[PDB]
Design a protein around this motif. Structure first.
Motif, PDB file in Angstrom:
ATOM      1  N   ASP A 239      57.977  27.865  31.423  1.00  0.00           N
ATOM      2  CA  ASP A 239      58.203  26.543  30.851  1.00  0.00           C
ATOM      3  C   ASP A 239      59.052  25.683  31.781  1.00  0.00           C
ATOM      4  O   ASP A 239      58.794  24.485  31.942  1.00  0.00           O
ATOM      5  N   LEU A 240      60.072  26.281  32.396  1.00  0.00           N
ATOM      6  CA  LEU A 240      60.967  25.527  33.268  1.00  0.00           C
ATOM      7  C   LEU A 240      60.217  24.946  34.460  1.00  0.00           C
ATOM      8  O   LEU A 240      60.375  23.767  34.796  1.00  0.00           O
ATOM      9  N   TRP A 241      59.385  25.761  35.108  1.00  0.00           N
ATOM     10  CA  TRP A 241      58.626  25.283  36.258  1.00  0.00           C
ATOM     11  C   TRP A 241      57.619  24.216  35.849  1.00  0.00           C
ATOM     12  O   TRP A 241      57.314  23.309  36.631  1.00  0.00           O
ATOM     13  N   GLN A 242      57.083  24.313  34.633  1.00  0.00           N
ATOM     14  CA  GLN A 242      56.180  23.276  34.146  1.00  0.00           C
ATOM     15  C   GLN A 242      56.913  21.959  33.934  1.00  0.00           C
ATOM     16  O   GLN A 242      56.471  20.909  34.416  1.00  0.00           O
ATOM     17  N   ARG A 243      58.036  21.995  33.216  1.00  0.00           N
ATOM     18  CA  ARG A 243      58.752  20.764  32.895  1.00  0.00           C
ATOM     19  C   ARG A 243      59.331  20.108  34.137  1.00  0.00           C
ATOM     20  O   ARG A 243      59.286  18.881  34.273  1.00  0.00           O
ATOM     21  N   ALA A 244      59.879  20.900  35.053  1.00  0.00           N
ATOM     22  CA  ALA A 244      60.720  20.349  36.103  1.00  0.00           C
ATOM     23  C   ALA A 244      59.967  20.072  37.392  1.00  0.00           C
ATOM     24  O   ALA A 244      59.937  18.932  37.864  1.00  0.00           O
ATOM     25  N   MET A 245      59.364  21.089  37.978  1.00  0.00           N
ATOM     26  CA  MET A 245      58.960  21.026  39.373  1.00  0.00           C
ATOM     27  C   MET A 245      57.451  21.231  39.448  1.00  0.00           C
ATOM     28  O   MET A 245      56.945  22.339  39.273  1.00  0.00           O
ATOM     29  N   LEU A 246      56.733  20.139  39.692  1.00  0.00           N
ATOM     30  CA  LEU A 246      55.281  20.166  39.761  1.00  0.00           C
ATOM     31  C   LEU A 246      54.840  18.968  40.589  1.00  0.00           C
ATOM     32  O   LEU A 246      55.641  18.345  41.289  1.00  0.00           O
ATOM     33  N   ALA A 247      53.552  18.660  40.515  1.00  0.00           N
ATOM     34  CA  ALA A 247      53.007  17.457  41.120  1.00  0.00           C
ATOM     35  C   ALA A 247      52.504  16.534  40.021  1.00  0.00           C
ATOM     36  O   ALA A 247      51.669  16.935  39.204  1.00  0.00           O
ATOM     37  N   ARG A 248      53.016  15.308  39.996  1.00  0.00           N
ATOM     38  CA  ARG A 248      52.621  14.320  39.002  1.00  0.00           C
ATOM     39  C   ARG A 248      52.421  12.989  39.718  1.00  0.00           C
ATOM     40  O   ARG A 248      52.392  12.925  40.950  1.00  0.00           O
ATOM     41  N   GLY A 249      52.277  11.918  38.945  1.00  0.00           N
ATOM     42  CA  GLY A 249      52.077  10.603  39.526  1.00  0.00           C
ATOM     43  C   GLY A 249      52.463   9.505  38.560  1.00  0.00           C
ATOM     44  O   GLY A 249      52.544   9.713  37.345  1.00  0.00           O
ATOM     45  N   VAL A 250      52.704   8.320  39.123  1.00  0.00           N
ATOM     46  CA  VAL A 250      53.064   7.175  38.297  1.00  0.00           C
ATOM     47  C   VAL A 250      51.885   6.737  37.438  1.00  0.00           C
ATOM     48  O   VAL A 250      52.072   6.195  36.342  1.00  0.00           O
ATOM     49  N   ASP A 251      50.658   6.950  37.914  1.00  0.00           N
ATOM     50  CA  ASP A 251      49.497   6.687  37.071  1.00  0.00           C
ATOM     51  C   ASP A 251      49.507   7.593  35.847  1.00  0.00           C
ATOM     52  O   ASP A 251      49.152   7.165  34.742  1.00  0.00           O
ATOM     53  N   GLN A 252      49.915   8.849  36.023  1.00  0.00           N
ATOM     54  CA  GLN A 252      50.095   9.719  34.871  1.00  0.00           C
ATOM     55  C   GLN A 252      51.217   9.222  33.973  1.00  0.00           C
ATOM     56  O   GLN A 252      51.169   9.423  32.757  1.00  0.00           O
ATOM     57  N   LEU A 253      52.228   8.565  34.545  1.00  0.00           N
ATOM     58  CA  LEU A 253      53.262   7.957  33.716  1.00  0.00           C
ATOM     59  C   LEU A 253      52.687   6.838  32.858  1.00  0.00           C
ATOM     60  O   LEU A 253      53.016   6.721  31.673  1.00  0.00           O
ATOM     61  N   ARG A 254      51.823   6.004  33.439  1.00  0.00           N
ATOM     62  CA  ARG A 254      51.171   4.961  32.655  1.00  0.00           C
ATOM     63  C   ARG A 254      50.284   5.567  31.575  1.00  0.00           C
ATOM     64  O   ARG A 254      50.243   5.073  30.441  1.00  0.00           O
ATOM     65  N   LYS A 255      49.572   6.642  31.910  1.00  0.00           N
ATOM     66  CA  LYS A 255      48.755   7.328  30.916  1.00  0.00           C
ATOM     67  C   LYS A 255      49.609   7.854  29.771  1.00  0.00           C
ATOM     68  O   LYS A 255      49.253   7.697  28.598  1.00  0.00           O
ATOM     69  N   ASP A 256      50.744   8.477  30.094  1.00  0.00           N
ATOM     70  CA  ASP A 256      51.616   9.013  29.055  1.00  0.00           C
ATOM     71  C   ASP A 256      52.193   7.902  28.189  1.00  0.00           C
ATOM     72  O   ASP A 256      52.297   8.050  26.966  1.00  0.00           O
ATOM     73  N   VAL A 257      52.581   6.785  28.804  1.00  0.00           N
ATOM     74  CA  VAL A 257      53.117   5.669  28.031  1.00  0.00           C
ATOM     75  C   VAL A 257      52.054   5.120  27.091  1.00  0.00           C
ATOM     76  O   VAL A 257      52.325   4.844  25.916  1.00  0.00           O
ATOM     77  N   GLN A 258      50.825   4.964  27.584  1.00  0.00           N
ATOM     78  CA  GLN A 258      49.760   4.451  26.733  1.00  0.00           C
ATOM     79  C   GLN A 258      49.312   5.461  25.687  1.00  0.00           C
ATOM     80  O   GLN A 258      48.598   5.086  24.752  1.00  0.00           O
ATOM     81  N   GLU A 259      49.708   6.723  25.816  1.00  0.00           N
ATOM     82  CA  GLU A 259      49.363   7.740  24.833  1.00  0.00           C
ATOM     83  C   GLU A 259      50.485   8.023  23.843  1.00  0.00           C
ATOM     84  O   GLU A 259      50.300   8.854  22.949  1.00  0.00           O
ATOM     85  N   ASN A 260      51.628   7.349  23.973  1.00  0.00           N
ATOM     86  CA  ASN A 260      52.796   7.572  23.117  1.00  0.00           C
ATOM     87  C   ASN A 260      53.323   8.999  23.234  1.00  0.00           C
ATOM     88  O   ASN A 260      53.840   9.564  22.269  1.00  0.00           O
ATOM     89  N   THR A 261      53.197   9.596  24.415  1.00  0.00           N
ATOM     90  CA  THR A 261      53.701  10.938  24.683  1.00  0.00           C
ATOM     91  C   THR A 261      54.645  10.934  25.875  1.00  0.00           C
ATOM     92  O   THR A 261      54.585  11.808  26.740  1.00  0.00           O
ATOM     93  N   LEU A 262      55.521   9.947  25.942  1.00  0.00           N
ATOM     94  CA  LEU A 262      56.481   9.896  27.034  1.00  0.00           C
ATOM     95  C   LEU A 262      57.538  10.974  26.833  1.00  0.00           C
ATOM     96  O   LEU A 262      58.051  11.129  25.719  1.00  0.00           O
ATOM     97  N   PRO A 263      57.868  11.752  27.864  1.00  0.00           N
ATOM     98  CA  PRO A 263      58.973  12.707  27.734  1.00  0.00           C
ATOM     99  C   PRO A 263      60.263  11.980  27.400  1.00  0.00           C
ATOM    100  O   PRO A 263      60.501  10.858  27.851  1.00  0.00           O
ATOM    101  N   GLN A 264      61.095  12.629  26.584  1.00  0.00           N
ATOM    102  CA  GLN A 264      62.305  11.973  26.099  1.00  0.00           C
ATOM    103  C   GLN A 264      63.201  11.545  27.251  1.00  0.00           C
ATOM    104  O   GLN A 264      63.630  10.388  27.323  1.00  0.00           O
ATOM    105  N   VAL A 265      63.489  12.458  28.170  1.00  0.00           N
ATOM    106  CA  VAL A 265      64.360  12.177  29.302  1.00  0.00           C
ATOM    107  C   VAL A 265      63.580  12.490  30.568  1.00  0.00           C
ATOM    108  O   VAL A 265      63.147  13.630  30.769  1.00  0.00           O
ATOM    109  N   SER A 266      63.406  11.487  31.420  1.00  0.00           N
ATOM    110  CA  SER A 266      62.574  11.613  32.609  1.00  0.00           C
ATOM    111  C   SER A 266      63.387  11.260  33.843  1.00  0.00           C
ATOM    112  O   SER A 266      63.938  10.159  33.935  1.00  0.00           O
TER     113      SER A 266
END
Ligand SMILES: [Ca+2]
Length: 686
Positions: A239-266
């Protein structure tokens, strides 16, 4: 509702190597290039002139003709930073650095950042926790302490912690705040383009001749959670490696915001091409901030409960004029009512922090209006803000850092919502794209900035205008007394602390800097608004008494200044030995409830004298007032200050008294309500 708990999503964005006066040295309303309480060198000139066998001064980088967005970074090692500090003198700025470090930008170079500053809350008293490299500052930001144990020993000062990507290959093993977040049960995530080994020297530190343009895949090894043993050796599927250290993107941030699933603390980490590092221009950082902002603001429900905090790690070698509060490190350099355990470097002996100024911009529906906040904050204030919101208390915070720095609850106005939208320009990506495009395409080929060809004829001014400011809990007293028997100088420093809407009762900690104009060394004090139980069973706090024996000259001459937070100035002059056998006046202050001031003059001498009070001509136009005060006499005067925006600067002089005798009082009355900035900033400094 209507409290701190209403906040639901928190985003932290942290750039690199940009000092305060480098960016907002010209902006109206900030303690910028025209601070009337500027530090004074020994020679009597203000610190804006620096001596390295010649006179250096700040100068304006003009991107419209030169390549100020492409300048190699300077040297900002620990020894360099401390030699810059010079135990509080702060006058060897050009001794170790290079001239180009004195440049500053204007609104013509960064319209986006200045629009953000004009529209959103900016902090002019935000300081870096460690006067040193990046990783230790980010170690403070992600853990709250840069040492395995809080005894002040083995605190890392060089750079070892890393992930074996760009030369940093260390591992540190103390409890990290995100681990407490995972244990508590609060959703947290880190947004970066890559995880382990994403950044590469062959890609970024070889001038990138293949591209030299853009890399939206790496992370420049700026993830401070990846340097810890638990994370670096966590299970690959954990779980720690999933939450913390991976490969993501700002486009995925826009996707998460538009899905109402933004992580609480980013924690939003940036690619090297955008993270404001001196290898790259501020325009690129502006473009990334635009991408984050438009990704975040793409929904009413998410933006109604989101707080975005943009800050920087260190100011690099770029010039800043203020001197940071520091804890005492030896004898004869002041006393602190709060134990400084773990705040002093054991091997070197000099204190670790705090450091020079770096920008902090708070973007939220509760933080509009373009306000300026005068309280002092450090990187630990972000973790303390997370503590205040979520209740998970990180014990790693050193007690001195816990007392000195605030919790960012004074920035935001939670008594309302203010859920309004944001200006179309800042969220409109394509124009910022045009700015980035013509920034790369034009400013790349322009000649580099110098100082031997672009010397300034005068010190830089400031933009015209005031700004509303936020209430601070600091209210201070500094009285001087002369021991007629022992012939010594006794300084009574006092604090009360102001009740705040964000601070339920008004706990606060103030730091005083005492500057010897003629002879001596700067002396620092730390007082607190609450009692502190010392290890010996004492009860310190709420008042400190010190003796300034070493400041005196051979003939009793004394001349010094007392600084502080929020433009607290007290200039003391005179002599001692001849002063014994005639009268002497003393000046005391009282803060009236309605924002006005009360000045009392106390005489314990042997002959009458005339005392005249002449305010600075800028604040007010009424004349000076003179009183013929006798021995064992005292009088009190009520000074109105609403038309001066609640600021005072008085000069008290006397006749039939000692030569060179002059008292100067200056500051802002704190009343617990927001007010305006200093009217004296837009008056030309010199
Ligand atoms: Ca850095």
């Amino acid at each position: 509702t209507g409290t701190i708990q209403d906040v639901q999503h928190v985003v932290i964005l942290m750039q690199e190597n940009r000092s305060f006066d480098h960016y907002f040295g010209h902006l109206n309303g900030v303690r910028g290039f025209n601070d009337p309480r500027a530090l004074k060198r020994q020679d009597g000139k203000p610190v804006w002139y620096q001596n390295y066998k010649y006179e250096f001064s700040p100068y304006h980088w003009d991107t419209k003709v030169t390549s100020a967005q492409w300048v190699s970074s300077q040297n900002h090692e620990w020894s360099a930073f401390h030699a810059i500090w010079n135990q509080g003198r702060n006058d060897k700025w050009m001794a170790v650095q290079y001239p180009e470090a004195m440049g500053y930008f204007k609104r013509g170079d960064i319209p986006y950042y200045y629009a953000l500053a004009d529209a959103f809350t900016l902090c002019e008293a935000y300081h870096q926790s460690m006067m040193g490299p990046t990783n230790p500052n980010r170690l403070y930001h992600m853990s709250g302490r840069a040492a395995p144990s809080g005894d002040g020993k083995d605190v890392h000062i060089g750079n070892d912690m890393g992930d074996g990507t760009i030369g940093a290959s260390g591992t540190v093993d103390w409890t990290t705040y995100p681990e407490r977040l995972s244990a508590a049960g609060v959703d947290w995530r880190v947004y970066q383009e890559g995880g382990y080994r994403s950044s590469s020297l062959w890609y970024l530190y070889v001038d990138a001749y293949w591209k030299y343009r853009l890399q939206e895949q790496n992370n420049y090894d700026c993830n401070a959670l990846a340097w810890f043993r638990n994370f670096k050796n966590a299970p690959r599927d954990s779980d720690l490696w999933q939450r913390a250290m991976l490969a993501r993107g700002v486009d995925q941030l826009r996707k998460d915001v538009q899905e109402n699933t933004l992580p609480q603390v980013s924690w939003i980490v940036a690619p090297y091409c955008y993270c404001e590092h001196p290898w790259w221009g501020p325009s690129f950082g502006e473009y990334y901030v635009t991408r984050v902002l438009d990704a975040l603001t793409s929904n009413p429900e998410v933006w109604a409960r989101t707080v975005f905090i943009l800050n920087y790690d260190e100011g690099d070698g770029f010039y800043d004029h203020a001197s940071a509060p520091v804890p005492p490190w030896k004898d004869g350099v002041g006393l602190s009512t709060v134990s400084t355990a773990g705040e002093i470097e054991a091997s070197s002996g000099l204190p670790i922090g705090l450091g020079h100024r770096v920008p902090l911009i708070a973007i939220s529906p509760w933080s509009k209006g373009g306000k300026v906040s005068a309280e002092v904050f450090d990187h630990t204030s972000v973790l303390r803000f997370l503590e205040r919101r979520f209740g998970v208390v990180e014990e790693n915070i050193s007690p001195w850092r816990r007392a000195v720095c605030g919790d960012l609850t004074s920035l935001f106005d939670f008594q309302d919502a203010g859920d309004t939208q944001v200006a179309p320009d800042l969220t409109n990506v394509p124009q910022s794209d045009a700015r980035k495009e013509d920034a790369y395409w034009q400013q790349f080929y322009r000649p580099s900035p110098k100082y031997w060809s672009y010397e300034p004829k005068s010190l830089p001014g400031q933009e015209k205008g005031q700004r509303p400011t936020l209430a601070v809990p600091y209210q201070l007293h500094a009285t001087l007394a002369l021991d007629i028997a022992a012939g010594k100088l006794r300084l009574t420093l006092g604090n009360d602390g102001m009740s705040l809407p964000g601070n339920p009762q008004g706990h606060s900690a103030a730091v005083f800097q005492v500057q010897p104009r003629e002879v001596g060394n700067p002396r620092f004090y730390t007082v607190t608004s609450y009692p502190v139980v010392q290890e010996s069973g004492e009860e310190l706090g709420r008042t400190l008494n010190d003796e300034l024996d070493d400041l005196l000259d051979a003939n009793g001459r004394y001349a010094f200044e007392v600084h502080g937070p929020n433009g607290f100035f007290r200039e003391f002059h005179g002599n001692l030995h001849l002063a014994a056998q005639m009268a002497r006046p003393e000046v005391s202050v009282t803060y009236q409830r309605n924002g006005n001031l009360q000045l009392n003059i106390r005489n314990l001498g042997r002959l009458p004298c005339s005392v005249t009070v002449t305010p600075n001509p800028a604040y007010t136009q009424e004349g000076s007032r003179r009183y013929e005060l006798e021995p064992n006499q005292a009088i009190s005067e009520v000074w109105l200050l609403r038309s001066s925006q609640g600021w005072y600067d008085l000069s008290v002089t006397a006749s039939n008294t000692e030569a060179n005798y002059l008292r100067r009082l200056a500051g802002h009355v704190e009343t617990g309500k927001p007010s305006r900035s200093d009217p004296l900033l837009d008056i030309a400094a010199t």
